[PDB]
Write a protein that binds this ligand. Structure first.
Ligand SMILES: *[C@](O)(C(N)=O)[C@H](CC1CCC1)NC(=O)[C@@H]1[C@@H]2[C@H](CN1C(=O)[C@@H](NC(=O)NC(C)(C)C)C(C)(C)C)C2(C)C
Ligand SMILES: *[C@](O)(C(N)=O)[C@H](CC1CCC1)NC(=O)[C@@H]1[C@@H]2[C@H](CN1C(=O)[C@@H](NC(=O)NC(C)(C)C)C(C)(C)C)C2(C)C
Lengths: 301, 301
């Protein structure tokens, strides 16, 4: 009992973090078997990032221009190539701590754990959710680019995020492990806008179910709603519309509590129209939308 | 930029978690060099925990009654002993993954990372703060007893907490690694009350400094207060009194922002009296007190 924002154990990912230096900039790289993945703007100077031609900039670089360090251990670069926005450096040594892994591109509304690193050294771990506008609310200082996001499936690290850039108001953007940015962003230091963000409705409901499981039930009412009636309220407050697929995903939570999903949507309907009146739910005075239904069942197991 | 509740990398601790079963009860153990530390109530039946005589119960127990599993390999218990509330099972094998470690007893208001484990397998990691009433607000299901809290100062791991029991409203209690309970709690299934909790004032101020560093500064006013005058408002709102030691601790944050500590106390004095007017600070509608000044400097370095 008790509900906390909880990240996956970072052990398997810690052994894959290395330090990549090219000229001025030092950042983090991901060392899978004999390839080191890192953001491609490691080759840029501060002037380059205003309007970089990564093709011509990378041609200026050769293998010996890339300094790769796993702790105090120098890796020798025997090849370099660019995949979208990620630099792939071939090294002479296969990473012996390489876990079973996949490269996944997560969907908006899903969560993952971030291993924040600096100069190739892991610093901390925390949970983040891919916002509907394809940004994340993380914690990244100068030197944390190349830090990765991941999920764990019984021994299989599903890498899904690599950090590249910072947006106003603690907003962060990055790519998958194939170099494709999440959202409309480009790795260039020029004016870019993130889309209008929306609240992940199915995540709020799962978080409301987590509160009921932990004995926090003051928000439950006697009313009920339909899917069209609730979605009418939902888009008024910039919530994502709820689908029957979302209702099926909340099945295990609805079954454990005995509360129908349409019943819970009626309580969320009142919470949006009347506010929380200074009350708290699971220790929060706001409606939380960064817990997936899977995140709830994993803690309420 | 950005501020998140961030736990330490759990890799060094993951290699120390084993499974300890004694008949009906299964929980987690901490495998340091050739000793497995775990809560002593593992030897108890459900009837035993109502009023256990741990000296008599441990005498009735043999080595072969302790099932210790590290992954799929079972460890040979070659001895047992009781230190306060922790059972120390000496094993055949020295843990080859033993990191450099200390046993520390933390002070109230300090934070640590919890590696939540189940059946000896790490499940998640999150941050917790030792409340002034010597409890923590974690996430522990049945089978998570023996999960440990820790801090990383170096290559060195500072173990500080081991989970034992659950209190109402998601409240948890445990011991240090020497078996001494934090607070007035005993490992017996009988009526026990936690003390009235207070808000960690120095932690709230550090969190307000983190908001200013991240550009969230609406709560700042031009007023100021005395350390004596501020503690009279803090006493009304169940806040811990602020000392000159706390003011000196907040030095680095005060210097980075250019805001004197007593100027920040004036802003907090008004937030307590006037409320927060339905606005957020670092994405929170409540005042957060689970970030130490060290936690803030670590993320705002
Ligand atoms: C990483 O590469 C690193 N060294 O850790 C770095 C992290 C930031 C956080 C301070 C430096 N990422 C970048 O520097 C990234 C490289 C240049 C521009 N970057 C930015 O983060 C800029 N943000 C930005 O331009 N935002 C928009 C596009 C205007 C909305 C900063 C102004 C924060 C430096 C590029 C190619 C994106
Ligand atoms: C761990 O041992 C475990 N198996 O993971 C277990 C965790 C709890 C959470 C459900 C099982 N800890 C205990 O069972 C602990 C052993 C008996 C009593 N315990 C409790 O946690 C009880 N709490 C409690 O009695 N609280 C007071 C004292 C009434 C305020 C439960 C009622 C939660 C089982 C003991 C020795 C404390």
């Amino acid at each position: 009992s008790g509900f906390r924002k909880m990240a996956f154990p970072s052990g398997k990912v810690e052994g894959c973090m290395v330090q990549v230096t090219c000229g001025t900039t030092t950042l983090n790289g991901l060392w899978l078997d004999d390839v080191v993945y890192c953001p491609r703007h490691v080759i840029c100077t501060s002037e380059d990032m205003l309007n970089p031609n990564y093709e011509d900039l990378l041609i200026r670089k050769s293998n010996h221009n890339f300094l790769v360090q796993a702790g105090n251990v120098q890796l020798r670069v025997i090849g370099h190539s660019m995949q979208n926005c990620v630099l792939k450096l071939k090294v002479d040594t296969a990473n012996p701590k390489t876990p079973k892994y996949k490269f996944v591109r997560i969907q908006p509304g899903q969560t993952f754990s971030v291993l924040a690193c600096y100069n190739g050294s892991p610093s901390g771990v925390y949970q983040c959710a891919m916002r509907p506008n394809f940004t994340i609310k993380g914690s990244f200082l100068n030197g944390s680019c190349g830090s990765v996001g991941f999920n764990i499936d019984y021994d299989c690290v599903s890498f899904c995020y690599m950090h590249h850039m910072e947006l106003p108001t603690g907003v962060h953007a990055g790519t998958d492990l194939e170099g494709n940015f999440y959202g409309p962003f480009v790795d260039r230091q020029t004016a870019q806008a993130a889309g209008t963000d929306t609240t992940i409705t199915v995540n709020v409901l799962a978080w409301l179910y987590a509160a009921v499981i932990n004995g926090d039930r003051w928000f439950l009412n006697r009313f009920t709603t339909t899917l069209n009636d609730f979605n009418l309220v939902a888009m008024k407050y910039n919530y994502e519309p709820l689908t029957q697929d979302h209702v099926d995903i909340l099945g295990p939570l609805s079954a454990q509590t005995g509360i129908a999903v349409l019943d819970m949507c009626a309580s969320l309907k009142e919470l949006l129209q009347n506010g929380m009146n200074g009350r708290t739910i699971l220790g929060s005075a706001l409606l939380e939308d960064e817990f997936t239904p899977f995140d709830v069942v994993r803690q309420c197991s």
